Amino acid sequence: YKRKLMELSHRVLQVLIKQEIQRKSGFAIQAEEEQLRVQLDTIQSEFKGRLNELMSQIRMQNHFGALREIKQHLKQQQEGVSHLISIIKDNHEDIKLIE
Amino acid sequence: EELKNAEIALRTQKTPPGLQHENTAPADYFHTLVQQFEVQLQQYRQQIEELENHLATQSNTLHLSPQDLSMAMQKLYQTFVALAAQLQAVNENFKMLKEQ
Amino acid sequence: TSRELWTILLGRSSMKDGYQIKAELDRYGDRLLQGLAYYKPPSTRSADKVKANKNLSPALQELGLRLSKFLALDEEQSVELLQTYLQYDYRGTQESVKVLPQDERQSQALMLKMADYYYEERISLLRCVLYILNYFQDDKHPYSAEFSKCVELMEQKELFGKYLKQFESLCREEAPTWETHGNFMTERQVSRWFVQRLREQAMLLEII
Amino acid sequence: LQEIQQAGERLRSK
Amino acid sequence: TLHREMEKVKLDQKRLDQELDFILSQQKELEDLLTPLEESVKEQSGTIYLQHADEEREKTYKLAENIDAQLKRMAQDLKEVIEHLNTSANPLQQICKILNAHMDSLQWIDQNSALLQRKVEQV
Amino acid sequence: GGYGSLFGIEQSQGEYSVTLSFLRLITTLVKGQLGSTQSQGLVPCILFVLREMLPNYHRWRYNSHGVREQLGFQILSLIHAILNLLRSLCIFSLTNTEAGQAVINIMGIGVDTLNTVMLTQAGSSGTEGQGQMLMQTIKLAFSITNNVIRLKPLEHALTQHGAHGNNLIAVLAKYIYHRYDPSLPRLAIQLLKRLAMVAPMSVYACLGSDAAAIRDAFLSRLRDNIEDMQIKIMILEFLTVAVETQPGLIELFLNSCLQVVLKLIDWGAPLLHRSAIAFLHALWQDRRDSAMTVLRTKPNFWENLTSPLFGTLACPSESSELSILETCAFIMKIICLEIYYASLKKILKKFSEEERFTYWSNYVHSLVCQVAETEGNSLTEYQQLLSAWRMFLIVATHNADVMHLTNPEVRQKLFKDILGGTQALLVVPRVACMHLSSMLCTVMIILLRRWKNDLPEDILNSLTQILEGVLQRDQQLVEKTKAQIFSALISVLEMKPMKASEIPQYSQLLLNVCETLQEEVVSLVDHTRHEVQKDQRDGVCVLGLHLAKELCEADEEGDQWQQVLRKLPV
């Protein structure tokens, strides 16, 4: 269902752009809209090669895949965090009561 | 989202058949669609650098260490300390207003 | 492609053996001999084949028919030149060629570059003939005797009359018009075809 | 490891 | 008590099952809806054709869609990278997973804390 | 100078025969090999040619077409010919002044403008048109930047993303489209390899949406058979280099490139297979796990990868193709690195049954001996091949079963051969022989230690003569050799308890041991005294001490020891 959501979403974007193409034409896509379009081309000009590098290192990792003492302090800190969380939530209750 | 968007596009395409104009909507739509992919690009590059540092460690990785635990422990201690300081600011502001 | 043949005769290629140069001359012999007449005008049979050549995507066959109408060249030769450009000259991935015949703008740009390619190909064939004639007797050129042999093969079949007739034809061709050449034959294209015919005349006269 | 990479980065940042 | 929670859990399974099928009937009725958009966009094209000339930039919105698609591939590859990183995941990796959980808890905690501070400021 | 007035009047009027004549004279002067004392007088003219001519020659009024281009071209010709001989000044000017960006622009005119002006030539002079001079100027700018990068703001401008969206490196890469003159794309590729060695931004980044296009173009241009074998090896080296300097592009390129390497590994050209197997060895070295796993999955990968080792090479005295030895070297290196980091087992069992160890050792010995007889033109070849045999035998002994290196007969053959090789190499009186014998010594030491239980009189006499030569040597370079030969002799005596009567030249042996002991001991004494390199002296000391202890334990009567202590106040 999620793949279908992304796919029909791309399709809906297609139908939207095509409806805004067929009708709104007529030397009418103008000043403010033109500004929007220019800002959009700009952002499009504003990475990809880093992404190829990401896939690269990821393939590298995918192929590469192909302490009783410490637990005490770790769990003590976890208990401390569980102690602090509730006091913060009480802060929030006091906030809502203040509003 | 996607269903109702297809619905709106179909409805606007239906009203045009007789005579209409519903176009500013898809304009703002393409605007938001670009604004979305904007952050995802930075995400792609940040993940790039993440995989880079990971594999940099992995070429070095043929061994492990015991100190990183103590480092992360002291850092998480100062961290939750700052977090509780922030929560204290929040409780004190709640109390200031609820006393006002 | 004539550009490759020319670059080969010019020695810019890693093929340095004389026999291979002789074989390449033999392969391009018919085109070198027929000269500018190689590119045939549109003909019904070639068009019906371009449609019937089932190996082609419909978008490609349509772009090719548009090209044949644009440059008044046979549809089959248009398809061949188009495949040559898109497989050797296209500065884009083999992916975008799937859509460029669907996108009208990309199709028009491809048509323009293809007309440029056809003209340049004619010029390249002429330059190849020029070099072969200019080095056929100089014993210092690495392919000298191969050149004299190709030149003798060209002379034995009366290269003179063929080049003269091609000169006359290029001299009496009516200027390209949008009526006969389709939507693309703008004034820019009229002047382009004119300068092209002028260059053809000049090169043919130099060859003579 | 993604959260852990992020958290290594953060605790290092502090 | 196990039987009690079992009754609740079977209720949850049934209800989520029904909700997924409802989302699916949405994914279908929405394909039907996206189709009338297509036929009416075809009508709009066959009408705009019945004019002089001058289509608008399509080679730009298509590039926008392509940027979206490339970002989608990037997110998919990031999912793959996360999956492989897990596939790589001694006491060491236990320490790392636990520290990551603790840091994530610290992050959501500071999030709730700032939410409280902002509610107070609005208060 | 008087030429400045003519230059000003030419710039004002729009014809530059005076300036061009000045340039021709200056180029002949700088090229005519004016003696070192004479270059200093022309350096002001050089600064004039570098600072005022090249940076503005684009803006100067051109009364006719071409003359601006030829002015720039003569400027670049002077610059290069000076740089091809002066050096420091041209380098500093190009790297810190406007000349850098000017030549950058000359390069960045883009291949399209080039080909366009190329189609503008109206006559047979397609090799002699204005476009020919233009391409000459472009290749000049390219070779210039190449030399400048080789000999060393310019780098920042070269990696900067131009303000118009076309990063200069992208314009450079697009030159791969130039199909009339191969030297231009070859030089662009050279600049690309250099920048990948030196630039910090990923080539994919500045390449943008054309990165994949350029990749496909490269794959086609390499795959084609009419491409220059020179360009072929150049691209193969480029790939290998990116494997060690450009990770992003190195990943982008394989996508696939491997099929080409397989096709070339089906005698195509020794250099091609050399560059290819080199790139492969490098990828296996850098732990390119994605690449390693992907390859190791391909069928017959080990078979087609190792087919070159199964052949027989010509004797090292004949003209044996250095590429064959270098290939086999990188191949054995890949096999090692794999086995260490880890079809293969079958290939190894074959090679062992194929006695490949025996032929390899015989050939390595012949090569070392040949290098020795020449006292160090085939030197580097035999050296690398010996490094190969060394690393091979090492990785073998570390896992003898995997190598099937259980044969004590083969173990003893190897030990004796390496020993005698160290000997013959260390016998030549007149630096190469030193390093070679030192490598052989480290090898023989580790080997004897591992194969002691498989491991004598002739060995004693040989190590005796060897220590003798090691004594007649200058001290500062023979220390490690002395220590090695000593541990060797110790192993020779510990191998079988022998009385002084069975030790040939035992008198001379103890004599030399005493001489060395005395010298080195006095040395260590002075060294420790000046301390008012700490551990090695004491190590050698204790070593000689235990050595003489055992030697005396062999002589219970001390009569020879008596004559010795009488000869030396030890």
Short mmCIF file of N, CA, C and O in Angstrom, two decimals, chain C residues 57-142:
data_model
loop_
_atom_site.label_atom_id
_atom_site.label_comp_id
_atom_site.label_asym_id
_atom_site.label_seq_id
_atom_site.Cartn_x
_atom_site.Cartn_y
_atom_site.Cartn_z
N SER C 57 11.54 1.56 -32.65
CA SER C 57 10.46 2.07 -31.83
C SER C 57 9.63 3.07 -32.63
O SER C 57 10.19 3.84 -33.42
N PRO C 58 8.31 3.07 -32.46
CA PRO C 58 7.48 4.00 -33.24
C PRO C 58 7.90 5.45 -33.09
O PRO C 58 7.92 6.19 -34.08
N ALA C 59 8.22 5.89 -31.87
CA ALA C 59 8.71 7.25 -31.70
C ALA C 59 9.94 7.49 -32.57
O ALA C 59 10.08 8.56 -33.18
N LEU C 60 10.83 6.50 -32.67
CA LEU C 60 12.03 6.66 -33.47
C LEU C 60 11.69 6.73 -34.96
O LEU C 60 12.25 7.56 -35.68
N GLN C 61 10.80 5.86 -35.43
CA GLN C 61 10.43 5.88 -36.84
C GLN C 61 9.75 7.19 -37.20
O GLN C 61 9.95 7.72 -38.30
N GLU C 62 8.95 7.74 -36.29
CA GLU C 62 8.31 9.02 -36.55
C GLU C 62 9.33 10.15 -36.58
O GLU C 62 9.27 11.01 -37.46
N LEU C 63 10.25 10.17 -35.62
CA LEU C 63 11.30 11.17 -35.65
C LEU C 63 12.11 11.06 -36.94
O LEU C 63 12.53 12.07 -37.52
N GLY C 64 12.31 9.83 -37.42
CA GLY C 64 13.06 9.64 -38.65
C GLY C 64 12.30 10.12 -39.87
O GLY C 64 12.89 10.69 -40.79
N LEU C 65 10.99 9.87 -39.91
CA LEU C 65 10.19 10.42 -40.99
C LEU C 65 10.22 11.94 -40.97
O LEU C 65 10.31 12.59 -42.02
N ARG C 66 10.17 12.53 -39.77
CA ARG C 66 10.28 13.97 -39.66
C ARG C 66 11.63 14.45 -40.19
O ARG C 66 11.70 15.47 -40.88
N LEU C 67 12.70 13.72 -39.89
CA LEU C 67 14.01 14.10 -40.38
C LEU C 67 14.09 14.00 -41.90
O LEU C 67 14.63 14.88 -42.57
N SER C 68 13.57 12.90 -42.46
CA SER C 68 13.58 12.72 -43.90
C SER C 68 12.79 13.82 -44.59
O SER C 68 13.17 14.29 -45.67
N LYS C 69 11.69 14.26 -43.98
CA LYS C 69 10.96 15.39 -44.53
C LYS C 69 11.74 16.68 -44.33
O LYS C 69 11.61 17.62 -45.13
N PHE C 70 12.55 16.76 -43.28
CA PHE C 70 13.26 18.00 -42.97
C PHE C 70 14.41 18.24 -43.94
O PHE C 70 14.61 19.37 -44.41
N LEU C 71 15.19 17.21 -44.23
CA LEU C 71 16.37 17.35 -45.07
C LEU C 71 16.18 16.79 -46.47
O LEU C 71 17.15 16.76 -47.24
N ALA C 72 14.97 16.36 -46.81
CA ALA C 72 14.67 15.83 -48.14
C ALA C 72 15.58 14.66 -48.50
O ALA C 72 15.96 14.46 -49.66
N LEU C 73 15.93 13.87 -47.49
CA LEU C 73 16.75 12.69 -47.68
C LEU C 73 15.90 11.45 -47.48
O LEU C 73 14.85 11.50 -46.83
N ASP C 74 16.35 10.34 -48.06
CA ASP C 74 15.63 9.08 -47.93
C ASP C 74 15.40 8.73 -46.47
O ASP C 74 16.25 8.99 -45.61
N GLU C 75 14.24 8.15 -46.19
CA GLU C 75 13.88 7.83 -44.81
C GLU C 75 14.82 6.79 -44.21
O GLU C 75 15.17 6.86 -43.03
N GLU C 76 15.22 5.80 -45.01
CA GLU C 76 16.12 4.77 -44.51
C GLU C 76 17.48 5.35 -44.15
O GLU C 76 18.03 5.06 -43.08
N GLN C 77 18.03 6.17 -45.04
CA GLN C 77 19.29 6.85 -44.73
C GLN C 77 19.12 7.78 -43.53
O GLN C 77 20.05 7.94 -42.73
N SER C 78 17.95 8.39 -43.40
CA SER C 78 17.69 9.23 -42.23
C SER C 78 17.75 8.41 -40.95
O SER C 78 18.37 8.83 -39.97
N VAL C 79 17.13 7.24 -40.95
CA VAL C 79 17.15 6.38 -39.77
C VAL C 79 18.57 5.92 -39.47
O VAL C 79 18.99 5.87 -38.31
N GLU C 80 19.32 5.55 -40.51
CA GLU C 80 20.70 5.12 -40.30
C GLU C 80 21.53 6.23 -39.68
O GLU C 80 22.25 6.02 -38.70
N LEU C 81 21.45 7.44 -40.24
CA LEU C 81 22.21 8.56 -39.70
C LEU C 81 21.77 8.89 -38.28
O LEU C 81 22.60 9.25 -37.44
N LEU C 82 20.48 8.77 -38.00
CA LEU C 82 19.98 9.05 -36.66
C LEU C 82 20.54 8.06 -35.65
O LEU C 82 20.98 8.44 -34.56
N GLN C 83 20.50 6.77 -35.99
CA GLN C 83 21.09 5.77 -35.10
C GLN C 83 22.57 6.02 -34.92
O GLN C 83 23.10 5.89 -33.81
N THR C 84 23.26 6.42 -35.99
CA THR C 84 24.69 6.70 -35.88
C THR C 84 24.94 7.83 -34.89
O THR C 84 25.81 7.73 -34.02
N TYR C 85 24.20 8.93 -35.02
CA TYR C 85 24.39 10.06 -34.12
C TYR C 85 24.05 9.69 -32.69
O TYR C 85 24.82 9.96 -31.76
N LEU C 86 22.89 9.06 -32.48
CA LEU C 86 22.45 8.77 -31.12
C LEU C 86 23.29 7.68 -30.47
O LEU C 86 23.29 7.56 -29.24
N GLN C 87 24.00 6.88 -31.26
CA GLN C 87 24.83 5.83 -30.69
C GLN C 87 26.30 6.22 -30.65
O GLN C 87 27.10 5.55 -30.01
N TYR C 88 26.67 7.30 -31.33
CA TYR C 88 28.05 7.76 -31.37
C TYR C 88 28.22 9.23 -31.01
O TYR C 88 29.26 9.59 -30.46
N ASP C 89 27.24 10.08 -31.32
CA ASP C 89 27.37 11.51 -31.10
C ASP C 89 26.47 12.06 -30.01
O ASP C 89 26.81 13.11 -29.44
N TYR C 90 25.36 11.41 -29.69
CA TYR C 90 24.46 11.90 -28.66
C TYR C 90 25.22 12.07 -27.36
O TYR C 90 25.86 11.13 -26.88
N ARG C 91 25.16 13.26 -26.79
CA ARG C 91 25.89 13.56 -25.57
C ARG C 91 25.08 13.25 -24.33
O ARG C 91 25.26 13.86 -23.27
N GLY C 92 24.17 12.29 -24.45
CA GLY C 92 23.32 11.90 -23.35
C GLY C 92 23.29 10.39 -23.20
O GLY C 92 23.70 9.65 -24.09
N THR C 93 22.79 9.95 -22.05
CA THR C 93 22.73 8.54 -21.73
C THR C 93 21.78 7.81 -22.67
O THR C 93 20.87 8.40 -23.26
N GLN C 94 22.00 6.50 -22.81
CA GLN C 94 21.07 5.67 -23.56
C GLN C 94 19.68 5.68 -22.94
O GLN C 94 18.73 5.16 -23.54
N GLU C 95 19.54 6.24 -21.74
CA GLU C 95 18.23 6.33 -21.11
C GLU C 95 17.37 7.41 -21.76
O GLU C 95 16.25 7.14 -22.18
N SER C 96 17.89 8.64 -21.84
CA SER C 96 17.07 9.76 -22.29
C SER C 96 16.63 9.61 -23.74
O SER C 96 15.68 10.29 -24.17
N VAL C 97 17.29 8.75 -24.52
CA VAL C 97 16.86 8.52 -25.89
C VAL C 97 15.50 7.85 -25.93
O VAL C 97 14.83 7.84 -26.97
N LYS C 98 15.06 7.26 -24.82
CA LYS C 98 13.73 6.67 -24.77
C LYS C 98 12.64 7.73 -24.76
O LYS C 98 11.53 7.48 -25.24
N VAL C 99 12.93 8.91 -24.21
CA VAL C 99 11.92 9.95 -24.07
C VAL C 99 12.09 11.07 -25.09
O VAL C 99 11.10 11.70 -25.48
N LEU C 100 13.32 11.35 -25.52
CA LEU C 100 13.56 12.46 -26.44
C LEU C 100 12.71 12.39 -27.71
O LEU C 100 12.42 13.46 -28.27
N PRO C 101 12.30 11.22 -28.20
CA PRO C 101 11.35 11.20 -29.32
C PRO C 101 9.92 11.44 -28.88
O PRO C 101 9.05 11.64 -29.74
N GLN C 102 9.64 11.41 -27.58
CA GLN C 102 8.32 11.75 -27.08
C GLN C 102 8.20 13.23 -26.73
O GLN C 102 7.16 13.83 -27.01
N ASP C 103 9.23 13.81 -26.13
CA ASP C 103 9.23 15.24 -25.82
C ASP C 103 9.43 16.01 -27.11
O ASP C 103 10.46 15.88 -27.78
N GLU C 104 8.42 16.81 -27.48
CA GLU C 104 8.48 17.56 -28.73
C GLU C 104 9.71 18.45 -28.79
O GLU C 104 10.36 18.56 -29.83
N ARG C 105 10.04 19.11 -27.68
CA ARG C 105 11.19 20.01 -27.67
C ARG C 105 12.49 19.25 -27.90
O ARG C 105 13.32 19.65 -28.73
N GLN C 106 12.68 18.16 -27.16
CA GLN C 106 13.87 17.34 -27.37
C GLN C 106 13.90 16.76 -28.78
O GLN C 106 14.96 16.67 -29.39
N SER C 107 12.73 16.39 -29.31
CA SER C 107 12.69 15.86 -30.67
C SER C 107 13.12 16.92 -31.68
O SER C 107 13.85 16.61 -32.63
N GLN C 108 12.68 18.16 -31.49
CA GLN C 108 13.07 19.23 -32.41
C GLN C 108 14.56 19.51 -32.32
O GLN C 108 15.23 19.71 -33.35
N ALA C 109 15.10 19.55 -31.11
CA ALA C 109 16.54 19.78 -30.97
C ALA C 109 17.33 18.66 -31.61
O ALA C 109 18.35 18.90 -32.27
N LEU C 110 16.88 17.42 -31.43
CA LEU C 110 17.54 16.29 -32.07
C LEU C 110 17.47 16.41 -33.59
O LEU C 110 18.43 16.10 -34.29
N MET C 111 16.33 16.86 -34.11
CA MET C 111 16.20 17.05 -35.55
C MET C 111 17.21 18.08 -36.06
O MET C 111 17.85 17.88 -37.10
N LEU C 112 17.36 19.19 -35.34
CA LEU C 112 18.31 20.21 -35.76
C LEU C 112 19.74 19.67 -35.75
O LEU C 112 20.48 19.83 -36.74
N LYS C 113 20.15 19.05 -34.65
CA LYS C 113 21.47 18.45 -34.59
C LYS C 113 21.66 17.40 -35.68
O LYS C 113 22.75 17.25 -36.21
N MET C 114 20.59 16.69 -36.04
CA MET C 114 20.71 15.66 -37.06
C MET C 114 20.91 16.26 -38.44
O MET C 114 21.65 15.71 -39.26
N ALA C 115 20.24 17.38 -38.73
CA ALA C 115 20.49 18.07 -39.99
C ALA C 115 21.93 18.55 -40.06
O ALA C 115 22.61 18.40 -41.09
N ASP C 116 22.41 19.14 -38.97
CA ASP C 116 23.81 19.51 -38.90
C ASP C 116 24.70 18.31 -39.15
O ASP C 116 25.71 18.40 -39.86
N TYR C 117 24.33 17.16 -38.58
CA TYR C 117 25.14 15.95 -38.73
C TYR C 117 25.18 15.49 -40.18
O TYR C 117 26.23 15.08 -40.67
N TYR C 118 24.04 15.53 -40.87
CA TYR C 118 24.01 15.10 -42.26
C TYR C 118 24.88 16.00 -43.13
O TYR C 118 25.68 15.52 -43.94
N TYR C 119 24.73 17.32 -42.97
CA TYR C 119 25.57 18.23 -43.73
C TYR C 119 27.04 17.98 -43.44
O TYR C 119 27.87 17.89 -44.37
N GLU C 120 27.39 17.85 -42.16
CA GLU C 120 28.78 17.61 -41.80
C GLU C 120 29.28 16.30 -42.38
O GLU C 120 30.45 16.18 -42.74
N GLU C 121 28.41 15.30 -42.46
CA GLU C 121 28.82 14.02 -43.03
C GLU C 121 29.15 14.16 -44.50
O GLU C 121 30.14 13.58 -44.98
N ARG C 122 28.33 14.90 -45.24
CA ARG C 122 28.65 15.16 -46.63
C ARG C 122 30.00 15.86 -46.74
O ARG C 122 30.85 15.49 -47.56
N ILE C 123 30.21 16.87 -45.90
CA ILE C 123 31.48 17.60 -45.93
C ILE C 123 32.64 16.66 -45.62
O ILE C 123 33.72 16.78 -46.21
N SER C 124 32.44 15.73 -44.69
CA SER C 124 33.51 14.81 -44.32
C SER C 124 33.86 13.90 -45.48
O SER C 124 35.04 13.64 -45.73
N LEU C 125 32.85 13.37 -46.16
CA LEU C 125 33.12 12.55 -47.35
C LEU C 125 33.92 13.34 -48.37
O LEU C 125 34.88 12.82 -48.97
N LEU C 126 33.55 14.61 -48.58
CA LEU C 126 34.29 15.43 -49.52
C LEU C 126 35.73 15.64 -49.07
O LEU C 126 36.66 15.58 -49.89
N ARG C 127 35.94 15.86 -47.78
CA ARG C 127 37.30 16.07 -47.27
C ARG C 127 38.13 14.80 -47.41
O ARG C 127 39.33 14.87 -47.67
N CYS C 128 37.50 13.64 -47.24
CA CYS C 128 38.20 12.38 -47.42
C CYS C 128 38.65 12.21 -48.86
O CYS C 128 39.81 11.84 -49.12
N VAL C 129 37.75 12.47 -49.80
CA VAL C 129 38.14 12.42 -51.21
C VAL C 129 39.28 13.40 -51.47
O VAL C 129 40.23 13.10 -52.20
N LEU C 130 39.20 14.59 -50.87
CA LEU C 130 40.24 15.59 -51.06
C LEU C 130 41.59 15.07 -50.60
O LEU C 130 42.58 15.17 -51.34
N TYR C 131 41.66 14.51 -49.40
CA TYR C 131 42.94 14.02 -48.89
C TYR C 131 43.46 12.87 -49.75
O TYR C 131 44.66 12.83 -50.06
N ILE C 132 42.58 11.95 -50.14
CA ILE C 132 43.01 10.82 -50.95
C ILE C 132 43.60 11.29 -52.27
O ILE C 132 44.58 10.73 -52.77
N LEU C 133 43.02 12.34 -52.85
CA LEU C 133 43.58 12.87 -54.09
C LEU C 133 44.85 13.66 -53.83
O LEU C 133 45.75 13.69 -54.68
N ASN C 134 44.95 14.30 -52.67
CA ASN C 134 46.09 15.17 -52.41
C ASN C 134 47.33 14.39 -51.99
O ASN C 134 48.43 14.95 -51.99
N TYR C 135 47.17 13.12 -51.61
CA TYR C 135 48.31 12.31 -51.22
C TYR C 135 48.48 11.04 -52.04
O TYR C 135 49.23 10.15 -51.62
N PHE C 136 47.83 10.92 -53.20
CA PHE C 136 47.85 9.67 -53.94
C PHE C 136 49.19 9.40 -54.62
O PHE C 136 49.44 8.26 -55.02
N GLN C 137 50.04 10.40 -54.77
CA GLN C 137 51.31 10.23 -55.47
C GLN C 137 52.52 10.50 -54.59
O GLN C 137 53.64 10.18 -54.99
N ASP C 138 52.33 11.08 -53.41
CA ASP C 138 53.44 11.38 -52.51
C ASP C 138 53.87 10.08 -51.85
O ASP C 138 53.14 9.51 -51.03
N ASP C 139 55.06 9.60 -52.21
CA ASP C 139 55.53 8.31 -51.72
C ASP C 139 55.86 8.32 -50.23
O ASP C 139 56.19 7.27 -49.68
N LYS C 140 55.78 9.48 -49.57
CA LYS C 140 56.14 9.56 -48.16
C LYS C 140 54.99 9.24 -47.22
O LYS C 140 55.23 8.95 -46.05
N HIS C 141 53.75 9.29 -47.70
CA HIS C 141 52.60 9.05 -46.84
C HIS C 141 52.51 7.57 -46.49
O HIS C 141 52.69 6.72 -47.37
N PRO C 142 52.23 7.23 -45.23
CA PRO C 142 52.26 5.81 -44.84
C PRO C 142 51.32 4.93 -45.64
O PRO C 142 51.60 3.74 -45.79
#
